[PDB]
Amino acid sequence: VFRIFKLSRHSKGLQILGQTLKASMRELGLLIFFLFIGVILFSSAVYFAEADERDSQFPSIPDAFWWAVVSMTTVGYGDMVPTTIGGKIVGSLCAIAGVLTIALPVPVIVSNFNYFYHRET
Amino acid sequence: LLFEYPESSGPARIIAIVSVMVILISIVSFCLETLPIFRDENEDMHGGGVTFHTYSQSTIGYQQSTSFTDPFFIVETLCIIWFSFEFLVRFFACPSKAGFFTNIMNIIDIVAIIPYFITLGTELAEKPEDAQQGQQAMSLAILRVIRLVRVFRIFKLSRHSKGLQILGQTLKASMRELGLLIFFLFIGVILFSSAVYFAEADERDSQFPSIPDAFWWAVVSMTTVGYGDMVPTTIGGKIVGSLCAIAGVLTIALPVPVIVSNFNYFYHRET
Ligand SMILES: [K+]
């Protein structure tokens, strides 16, 4: 899987992508950290709010965690979906929270990348 | 006490890494325990079936498998107590009564324990006449609080989590911007649901009309989640899909730059 990477000596963009990430870690570390908190929270409510009526998105937390991550990144594979009413708000508040939190660490990483790409060029 | 606060809030030492670890290990624990309420029970099975002499004594099993939560109750019992010991020490600080300035960290702290502690008394939530009249089968108080409360536990992290302090300050001081987003989204959602309603149900079986169901679709389609649970086989919603999805991204993108900016000044700051 790792083989691809080597390319970066004949790939300037990768040198640029690297320098950003290696020097942009705290910003990236926050994103995933925030996402973690979000994911956990938004999973535990749907749990408390769905399983009463039968067959909906399998409760057990590490399965509702799949849904939460997905719904936010706004991927929504549709593998997890609730026929119920309680998760209706969650869908709303979660999806909203995703875009908010996801958009947060973007401008910084992007900015770093802009100075770095503009540079070796 | 000027030497216990060294052990308490302020300095960076062993006790801070342990508390965050209790939180994390604790969260992981409750998580896994809540999954299979019944341990190692789904597999080879049987029941009350008349086929032959077999259904008679049905193999319910008389010594099957141990059922236990003591050690995890230990996770909860021991955490709440350190919470209270410390929080109780945190009183050897400075006190008052309010609901605004004081300390949201202390409110959040108390909010995780007081529920589990409370839940242990069989009941004491005599709430409403019509409800209490017959608490009958109702674990309603337990239904409401027990899960909201434990959901809340994660938050505490924010004293050892700067990003959360930053996320907070933004939101608390960025409310009007956030309030507009949801308000705009509301207007959008409602509107975009009522047209599809007028435009879909003529031919049969499409996305269940009734407005609070088309509202699910509208919110989803915009946030651009599109679970595919609601989709129309029809032609009228075709434009709506277009105009709605377009409107979503437009409206959603609007309150982003402000909240982000606030966050940038706040994150850049404590740093
Ligand atoms: K986007």
UniProtKB/Swiss-Prot annotation, chain A:
Induction: Up-regulated in brain cortex in response to ischemia (at protein level). Down-regulated in dorsal root ganglion neurons after peripheral nerve injury (at protein level). Down-regulated in pulmonary artery myocytes in response to chronic moderate hypoxia. Residues 12-25 are annotated as: S4-S5 linker. It is found in: Cell membrane; Membrane; Cell projection, Axon; Synapse. Changing T83A: Impairs N-glycosylation and abolishes expression at the cell surface. Residues 11-25 are cytoplasmic. Phosphorylated on tyrosine residues; phosphorylation increases in response to ischemia. Phosphorylated on tyrosine residues by activated PTK2B/PYK2. Phosphorylation on tyrosine residues suppresses ion channel activity. Phosphorylated on tyrosine residues in response to CHRM1 activation; this abolishes interaction with CTTN. This is probably due to endocytosis of the phosphorylated channel subunits. Phosphorylated on serine residues in response to increased cAMP levels; phosphorylation is apparently not catalyzed by PKA. N-glycosylated, with complex, sialylated N-glycans. Residues 48-61, 82-88 are extracellular. Changing S60A: No effect on N-glycosylation. Abolishes channel activity of the homotetramer, but retains channel activity in the presence of a beta subunit. It comes from the Eukaryota. Residues 62-73, 74-81 dip into the membrane without crossing it. Belongs to the potassium channel family. A (Shaker) (TC 1.A.1.2) subfamily. Kv1.2/KCNA2 sub-subfamily. Homotetramer and heterotetramer with other channel-forming alpha subunits, such as KCNA1, KCNA4, KCNA5, KCNA6 and KCNA7. Channel activity is regulated by interaction with beta subunits, including KCNAB1 and KCNAB2. Identified in a complex with KCNA1 and KCNAB2. Identified in a complex with KCNA5 and KCNAB1. Identified in a complex with KCNA4 and FYN. Interacts (via C-terminus) with the PDZ domains of DLG1 and DLG2. Interacts with DLG4 (via PDZ domain). Interacts with PTK2B. Interacts (via C-terminus) with CTTN. The delay or D-type current observed in hippocampus pyramidal neurons is probably mediated by potassium channels containing KCNA2 plus KCNA1 or other family members. It is activated at about -50 mV, i.e. below the action potential threshold, and is characterized by slow inactivation, extremely slow recovery from inactivation, sensitivity to dendrotoxin (DTX) and to 4-aminopyridine (4-AP). This is Potassium voltage-gated channel subfamily A member 2. The lineage of its organism: Eukaryota, Metazoa, Chordata, Craniata, Vertebrata.
